[PDB]
Ligand binder design. Sequence first.
Ligand SMILES: CC[C@H](NC)c1ccncc1
Length: 185
Amino acid sequence: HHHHHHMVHITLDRNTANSWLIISKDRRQVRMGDTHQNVSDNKERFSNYPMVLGAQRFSSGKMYWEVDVTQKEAWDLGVCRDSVQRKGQFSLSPENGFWTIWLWQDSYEAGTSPQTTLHIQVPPCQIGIFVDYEAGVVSFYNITDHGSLIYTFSECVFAGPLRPFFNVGFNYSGGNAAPLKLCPL
Ligand SMILES: CC[C@H](NC)c1ccncc1
C-alpha cells in the first residue's frame, strides 16, 4: 500500500479506558493491569472489556496509523463511532458502530455480523489501519508481511465522528500481558 503519507499521531484517551488499564505517560502504550488502577468511574469508561479510545476524532479525510501487537494472544483493533455503547455486553459489528479485526484463540477474524475468517500466512507483529471517511472504507494491513492487505470494510455507514479503537484483551492465560503500542511515524 501507499497510505503511509496520511499518517496521523494517535494518543490514547485515559478518560475512556476500562479502570484496569495502564496507559503510558506519552499516551502511546496501553496494557492490562493485574487490578483496578485506582481511578474514579465515569460514563465514558468501557465497563465490561479492556477497551480504550484514541483522543482524536475524525469526520473527513484520509487517516493512517500503526499498532504493535507483538507477543499478544488476543486483541481487537480498528475504529468506532464516538457514540458507541460503553456499559454492559455488546458485540463488535458495524451495526453497533465498530469496524474492527481481532486475534482470538490462534485465529484472526473481521468484526462483521457474523464474523469473517481472515487468511494471514505471516502472523503480524504490527498492523496498519487506513480510514477514508468520504469513501466509507476501513482497511487493515500486515506491516510484518510488506504491507499485505488483511481486510477491507467498504460501504461503511460511519454515521458520526470516528475514534481509534483498542482492546488489549483479558489475560486469563498469563500469556497476554504485553501492551498495544502506537508505532512511530
Ligand atoms: C472483574 C472481572 C474481570 N476480571 C478479569 C474484569 C472485567 C472487566 N474489566 C476488568 C476486569
